[PDB]
Structure 1
């Protein structure tokens, strides 16, 4: 059950009882990307109207 593992481990990361090196890595690439102005657009407001 891939949903149980991903959901359970995600919840544990938010409770401070598990550390996901991969997620922390991705969280910082998003933070840096948003500062550079390359972040995800909002839904319905994409480049094409």
Structure 2
């Protein structure tokens, strides 16, 4: 269903129990992109 999967990983990461580097990458890259763009 992908929704239980992805939203559970979303919730666990923003609870801080999960660390996924792909979302870390998009956070840092969008931080710099909102900094300059």
User: Over alpha carbons, which structure has the higher Rg?
Assistant: 1
TM-score (structure 2 length as normaliser): 0.90
Cα RMSD of the aligned pairs, angstroms, is: 0.6
Gaps of 5+ in 1: 38-49
Gaps of 5+ in 2: none
Q: How many residues align?
A: 37
Could you list the runs of 4 or more consecutive aligned residues of structure 1 that deviate by over 4 angstroms after TM superposition? none
User: Which structure shows the higher helix fraction?
Assistant: 2
Question: Greater relative contact order (Cα 8 A, min sep 6): structure 1 or 2?
Answer: 2
